[PDB]
Design a protein around this nucleic acid. Structure first.
Ligand SMILES: Nc1ncnc2c1ncn2[C@@H]1O[C@H](COP(=O)(O)OP(=O)(O)OP(=O)(O)O)[C@@H](O)[C@H]1O
Ligand SMILES: Nc1ncnc2c1ncn2[C@@H]1O[C@H](COP(=O)(O)OP(=O)(O)OP(=O)(O)O)[C@@H](O)[C@H]1O
Ligand SMILES: [Ca+2]
Ligand SMILES: [Ca+2]
Ligand SMILES: [Mg+2]
Ligand SMILES: [Mg+2]
Lengths: 167, 98, 319, 319
DNA sequence: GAATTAACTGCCCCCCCCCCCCCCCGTCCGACTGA
DNA sequence: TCAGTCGGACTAGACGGATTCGATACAGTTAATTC
């Protein structure tokens, strides 16, 4: 029964998200309904409240959220998947030399993670062949080399292209 | 940890205990730290975290750069050798040179 | 920890029924508390009375107040899709434009971003049987490009009262970003008195190009746009209306592009891309015909369609 | 029409603040009301609280709320349109040049932009019953091609006194982009002093071709042009005059092997493409006959018309 | 003539590959065509 | 009769590149000032 074993929550503020992860999530994990946590956009609440001159409160909130998420994941052995947005380089470091885009939320958020992925799509300039080009890349991991592959989106779901992994 | 003084006291005590253990049992203590952006002048640069008092709580300090697609291991503080710069990279076999 | 299924008998059920529920794949109170009623009662020999009884037992035993995907889909399945006036566009968008979401159209110059807005402002008042939304319309203007005589043509095409249509479309003009953002509080106040089915902003990012200029003012502009889009999303979620906004384009003057057919990208950066749900890309076609392409959508594949701008509004290409 | 800024001190504003606003460029209450808070902050003697009070008073004086479409439609129907001197052009434009919006004309050389500008400069002084506007004319010249002999010829055609017509036209010459932008404040002062009904800027983008040469100066040029267009738009909204500007063309070197055999597009880019409300495309026919085409409009279908340049000015194609 | 203060400038190095058309300004005549 | 309009041969067809923009302190060098 796929439908009845998925729970959906809505938040609007950073404080609302913090309260949700502090109160509602542990109740669901402890009783055993779910063993997977997905955040649709962690960067969305933080990009609407803090400017370039308010880095310290944002860092405090990010550290608290990361600590709470890591504690819950370690306690209940449930993977945590976070979806993030990107910002351009605006060339005038962190390992991104010739990349046009980089993950958002700075380096404080990047210190809280374990495996960092990156999904990229080449626009019509490189996608003038008829179909969009999508590549899923591994940025860093304690046990995975930097690699990449290709995938397509269809009516069935996301499927990777066989014989495409780069070494 | 909102109270900075408690953190400083704990860090100093931990460093003293670790150096005592190393000298008493003939060990080689290895510690790992994190980098933090500091907006100096107007061009931000990465500096080690945990404040400035912690700076001389370790006998030897090493920093790993990124430069331009090239990993560099630069010695920072040591009572035996002058600071220099050395390149390195990670292979599927582990920590290697070249 | 979790409460096993062996606790139901103390609440007023016999071993037979609790076992019947147990071998049906369920093994805990938590699973059966949120189980759908029809899937609970479809088993032969299961009566609705005892089903409601055990549901009440679970509700007073299991912590409730958690939304579920099946309940989320079966509770909000009465969404409305307003027709755009073109059969090809309705087919491409699979019925029209949904409510409770933000749809943006971006393109260059003489493409039909305002004619579509006018047609939607007229067609949103049609009865739900005829493909409308049965509500009023709100038009927020930033360029002084609102023509009631264009709405009159569509109202005459669909056989509606000319004077009634012009009475259901509230109008407002924005002169800066502060005024544009301030108008949303008045909109929220107005949406309680009556029922609205559409809200049009044209153009959403027209004033941001000139109010903030240069690299120095980029961050403030982006944050202001993000706050405005957050307010729009809150309004759409609270009142269940359809929000349609229009965007502009900027050239790509670097050598990375090679197809050389006047490369262009929408303005606004990543905030406007992430905030909006469905994005459409209109381009010029032969004669008065135009081509509409789906740029981004969570549940649609990229495709193409052709429409035309006629004397009666947006329609289909003539033969 | 507009209320002079000298009515703010009656609401609780010290005279020095009004004087500072006057040096700032705001000469009416409407100008202050439309301005964002950031523009008011940049004044030396005005703080945030002073700007808040001034904005509150301006919003009290000027209505900036929501309105029914019926009121807007009724108010729009009484706007004035100025005849172009040609019956075919008037039929194509459905009355003539509208007031309160920016109209742009572009084309290659000897296509008749300056002659149309002169004809509009003369015909704008006619009584409203004859297709005029009953006002004065303002001519801003950036090339040095202003000749009062054409104005005298048109006045003799229309049976007006030559001396009076020449006395009702204001002329200024712009030598650079910075000087061109600086001329839009004295224009505001003269417009608030006396009733004007037209404003010709020819050519609007002539100096930008030379002041900014390469690709490394594109961003600054586009930002300057956008600010200039925003100032033109605020003038048009505040005083309700007709704004007519002219443009130039640039070749399409890539070609792409299209049928035109000599492709060319107007200069300025997406900024002036999205800012202009109505655009006219002029080209040469045979002898003295020219062809005008609708290139962009919110309420006019794409169509063409033929006019001619005679010894009396712009007129219908003489047989 | 000189000690002394004040004003204008400056902080820098990577992109060497090459399918891609797109919505007409053709210049105009032959013939169709319906009225 | 009569002009607008669909569709199209008309002697002949190829060509390539191009750069900038930030929000900032202190020294170096040249210019103004009063004894
Ligand atoms: N009555 C009509 N009959 C036929 N076509 C019309 C009619 N009114 C307008 N049009 C055409 O519709 C188009 C109007 O473009 P529109 O105003 O939608 O552009 P836009 O995308 O809003 O542009 P901008 O960026 O300047 O705001 C023009 O190409 C015009 O020729
Ligand atoms: N007195 C006149 N009688 C008849 N035709 C005239 C007279 N004066 C000028 N013209 C016509 O005006 C034409 C040029 O028009 P105009 O000066 O408006 O050009 P334009 O499009 O403004 O040019 P530019 O691009 O150089 O600014 C000439 O080709 C000429 O035939
Ligand atoms: Ca989206
Ligand atoms: Ca336009
Ligand atoms: Mg428009
Ligand atoms: Mg001229």
């Amino acid at each position: 029964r796929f439908g009845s074993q998925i729970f959906i929550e809505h938040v609007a503020d950073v404080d609302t998200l913090l309260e949700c992860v502090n109160k509602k999530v542990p109740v669901l994990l402890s009783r055993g309904m779910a063993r997977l946590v997905v955040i649709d956009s962690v960067a969305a609440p933080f990009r609407c409240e803090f400017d370039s001159q308010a880095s310290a409160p944002r860092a405090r909130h990010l550290q608290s959220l990361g600590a709470t998420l890591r504690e819950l994941s370690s306690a209940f052995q449930s993977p945590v998947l976070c979806i993030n947005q990107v910002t351009e380089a605006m060339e005038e470091p962190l390992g991104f030399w010739d990349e046009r885009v980089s993950p958002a939320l700075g380096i404080t958020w990047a210190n809280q993670l374990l495996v960092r992925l990156l999904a990229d799509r080449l626009r019509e300039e490189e996608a003038a062949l008829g179909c969009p080009a999508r590549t899923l890349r591994v940025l860093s991991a304690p046990h995975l080399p930097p690699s990449s592959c290709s995938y397509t989106i269809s009516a069935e779901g996301v499927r990777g292209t066989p014989g495409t992994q780069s070494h | 940890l909102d109270d900075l003084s408690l953190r400083t006291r704990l860090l100093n005590g931990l460093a003293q205990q670790m150096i005592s253990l190393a000298n008493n049992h003939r060990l080689a203590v290895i510690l790992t730290n994190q980098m933090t952006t500091k907006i100096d002048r107007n061009q931000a640069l990465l500096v080690p975290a945990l404040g400035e008092s912690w700076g001389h709580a370790a006998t030897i300090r090493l920093i790993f750069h990124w430069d331009r697609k090239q990993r560099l291991a630069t010695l920072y503080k040591s009572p035996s050798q002058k600071e220099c710069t050395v390149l390195f990279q990670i292979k599927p076999q582990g920590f290697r040179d070249t | 920890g979790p409460q096993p299924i062996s606790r139901l008998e103390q609440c007023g059920i016999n071993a037979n029924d609790v076992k019947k529920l147990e071998e049906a794949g369920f093994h805990t109170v938590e699973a059966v508390a949120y189980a759908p009623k029809k899937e609970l009662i479809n088993i032969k020999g299961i009566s609705e009375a005892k089903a409601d009884k055990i549901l009440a037992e679970a509700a007073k035993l299991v912590p409730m107040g958690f939304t579920t995907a099946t309940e989320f889909h079966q509770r909000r399945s009465e969404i409305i899709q307003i027709t755009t006036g073109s059969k090809e566009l309705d087919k491409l968008l699979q019925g029209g434009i949904e409510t409770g979401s933000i749809t943006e159209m971006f393109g260059e110059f003489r493409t039909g971003k305002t004619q579509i807005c006018h047609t939607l402002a007229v067609t949103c008042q049609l009865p739900i049987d005829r493909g409308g939304g049965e509500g009023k319309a709100m038009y927020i203007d930033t360029e002084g490009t609102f023509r009631p005589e264009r709405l009159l043509a569509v109202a005459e095409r669909y056989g509606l009262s000319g004077s009634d249509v012009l009475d259901n479309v509230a109008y407002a003009r924005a002169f800066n970003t502060d005024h544009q953002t301030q108008l949303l509080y008045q909109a929220s106040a107005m949406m309680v008195e009556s029922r609205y089915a559409l809200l049009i902003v044209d153009s959403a990012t027209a004033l941001y190009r000139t109010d903030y200029s240069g690299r120095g003012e980029l961050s403030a502009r982006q944050m202001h746009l993000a706050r405005f889009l957050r307010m729009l999303l809150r309004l759409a979620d609270e009142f269940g209306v359809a929000v349609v906004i229009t965007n502009q384009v900027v050239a790509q003057v670097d050598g990375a592009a090679m197809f050389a057919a006047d490369p262009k990208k929408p303005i606004g950066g990543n905030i406007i891309a992430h905030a909006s749900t469905t994005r459409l890309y209109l381009r010029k076609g032969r004669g008065e015909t135009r081509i509409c392409k789906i740029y981004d959508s969570p549940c649609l594949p990229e495709a193409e369609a052709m429409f035309a701008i006629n004397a009666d509004g947006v329609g289909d290409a003539k033969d």
